[PDB]
Design an enzyme around this catalytic site. Structure first.
Site, short mmCIF file in Angstrom:
data_model
loop_
_atom_site.label_atom_id
_atom_site.label_comp_id
_atom_site.label_asym_id
_atom_site.label_seq_id
_atom_site.Cartn_x
_atom_site.Cartn_y
_atom_site.Cartn_z
N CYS A 1 -0.66 -0.70 -4.13
CA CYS A 1 0.55 0.46 -3.82
C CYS A 1 1.20 0.06 -2.59
O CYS A 1 2.04 -0.85 -2.52
CB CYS A 1 -0.35 1.83 -3.96
SG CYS A 1 -1.56 2.19 -2.63
N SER A 2 1.26 1.06 -1.48
CA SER A 2 1.97 0.80 -0.04
C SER A 2 0.98 0.18 0.82
O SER A 2 1.40 -0.82 1.24
CB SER A 2 2.38 2.10 0.23
OG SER A 2 1.59 3.23 0.21
#
Ligand SMILES: CC1(N)CCN(c2cnc(-c3cccc(Cl)c3Cl)c(N)n2)CC1
Length: 484
Positions: free
Chosen positions: A418-419
């Site tokens: 994801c991030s």
């Protein structure tokens, strides 16, 4: 992690810090969270927000864990704010036992005897509120090997002037203090029996078939928050070293400089220069990682090649709410790109509503028979804040991802990013580990959601970020079983 008070108000916290604290005293409390700190005989309330990616301290850095946040400022002094130097010197410890694994408060003496008899082994213990004489507590421990070679021993705990005793000896200011003492210093009974406090009774493990009953129990006034916070309180046993991530040459390769891979699980890159903010997750294995930087895309493909991964799970857009979360590390459809010594062709894109599939072909420049298909699954509809309302889309995504991996012989870890690679990434892996048990062992299997999160959180930091995600793991398992 006593410095966390689960059921405190700002006023109660100021009071606590002003009357039972000194300057440099601090605790943390649920409000997003608040860091309360005494200074010049006054209290500052530092705001901490987690909407599912990380803990963002206002005027400070981003952290994977509340424990790792406190660790950082207690050692990395002077970095905490009018930007004025705020010191975390002295934790104010909480005596409320609601976040303890062994505190089933309102449990009956008979019901506790049955639990210890059906689920308990030698050393399974619990503390409950007194059956007859209220305000007092009962420690019930199972000892042994209907043979009668085992037994459940009860031990009255008296609360006298806000202190706790087992009818003699030391008086403790909290049940935790009493439990921790009698864990290291076990009570020995008349005729020799040692009342050993080995492991708290497991009440979190259920049979998969009875998920609907449990999710309903945890929904009542909620248990979901109660269970989750008991899990947060164990994050203090997972402060493993992240030295390689803090090295000079490696600060630029972290997207969040304090969200760092554990040294003992990190992906070491050979033939390069060995660092990536990535961790191997072994219950099908996974590599949990952060969205690429401009300066880490070459290292990202070195990892996928090295690990022989044929499947990538991306659960973020390139940009969310104006902020970059991951660089485009893949070519355009039909195009061919070189990322250092790694060559990636984008064979075909197949769009669904919730995700895009990209058939990529990966190889080393100069070596034709190194080529493999790497299927990239980019989930594009994950809400900017919180978790998806309906789990059907995420499980449909998982089912398609699982079937692709199962279809390839000698596939490496499924790469999941994801991030920062801890909130959504950890949510998906954990859902996938759990659904995978029910796939291999049928609905007649033992699943224990927090056991699985703690095992994954010992491999990468903060692997399930929010209570909303935590709940969403239960709803995912409920939904999957319902549609069977
Ligand atoms: C009512 C109560 N006081 C809160 C709920 N509860 C529990 C129990 N055990 C876990 C657990 C299970 C496996 C691993 C880990 Cl690390 C943990 Cl913490 C948990 N999360 N909650 C029971 C006591």
């Amino acid at each position: 992690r006593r410095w966390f008070h689960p059921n405190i108000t700002g006023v109660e916290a100021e009071n606590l810090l002003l009357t039972r604290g000194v300057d440099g005293s601090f605790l943390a409390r649920p409000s997003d969270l608040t860091l309360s700190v005494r200074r010049n005989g006054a209290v500052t309330h530092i705001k901490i927000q987690n909407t599912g990616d990380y803990y963002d301290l206002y005027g400070g850095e981003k952290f994977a864990t509340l424990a790792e946040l406190v660790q950082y400022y207690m050692e990395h002094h002077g970095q905490l704010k009018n930007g004025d130097v705020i010191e975390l010197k002295y934790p104010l410890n909480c005596a409320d036992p609601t976040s303890e694994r062994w505190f089933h408060g309102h449990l009956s003496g008979k019901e506790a005897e049955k639990l210890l008899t059906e689920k308990g082994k030698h050393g399974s213990f619990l503390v409950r509120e007194s059956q007859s004489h209220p305000g007092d507590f009962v420690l019930s421990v199972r000892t042994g090997d209907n043979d009668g070679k085992s037994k459940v021993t009860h031990v009255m705990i008296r609360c006298q002037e806000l202190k706790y005793d087992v009818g003699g000896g030391e008086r403790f200011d909290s049940l935790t203090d009493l439990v921790e003492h009698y864990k290291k210093n076990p009570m020995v009974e008349t005729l020799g029996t040692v009342l050993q406090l080995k492991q708290p009774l497991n009440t979190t493990r259920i049979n998969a078939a009875e998920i609907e009953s449990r999710v309903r129990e945890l929904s009542k006034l909620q248990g979901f928050w109660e269970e989750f916070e008991t899990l947060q309180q164990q994050e203090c046993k997972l402060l493993y070293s992240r030295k390689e991530g803090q090295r000079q040459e490696n600060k630029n390769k972290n997207r969040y400089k304090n969200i760092l891979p554990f040294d003992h699980t990190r992906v070491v890159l050979h033939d390069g220069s060995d660092y990536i903010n990535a961790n191997i997750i072994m219950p099908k294995s996974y590599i949990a990682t952060q969205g690429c930087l401009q300066n880490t895309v070459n290292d990202f493909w070195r990892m996928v090649f090295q690990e022989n991964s044929r499947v990538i799970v991306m659960t973020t857009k390139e940009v969310e709410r104006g902020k970059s979360k991951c660089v485009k590390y893949w070519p355009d459809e039909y195009a061919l790109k070189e990322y250092g010594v790694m060559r990636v062709r984008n064979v075909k894109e197949s769009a669904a509503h919730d995700y895009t599939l990209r058939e990529l072909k990966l190889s080393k420049v100069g070596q034709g028979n190194t080529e493999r298909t790497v299927w990239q699954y980019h989930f594009r509809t994950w809400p900017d804040h919180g978790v998806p309302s309906d789990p059907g889309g995420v499980l449909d995504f998982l089912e398609e991802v699982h079937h692709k991996q199962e279809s390839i012989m000698d596939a490496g870890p499924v790469v999941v990013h994801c991030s920062a690679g801890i909130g959504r990434t950890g949510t998906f892996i954990v859902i996938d580990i759990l659904i995978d048990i029910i796939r291999e062992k049928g609905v007649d299997c033992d699943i224990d959601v927090p056991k699985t999160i703690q095992m994954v959180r010992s491999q990468r930091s903060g692997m399930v970020q929010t209570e909303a995600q935590y709940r969403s793991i239960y709803m995912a398992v409920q939904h999957y079983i319902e549609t069977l």
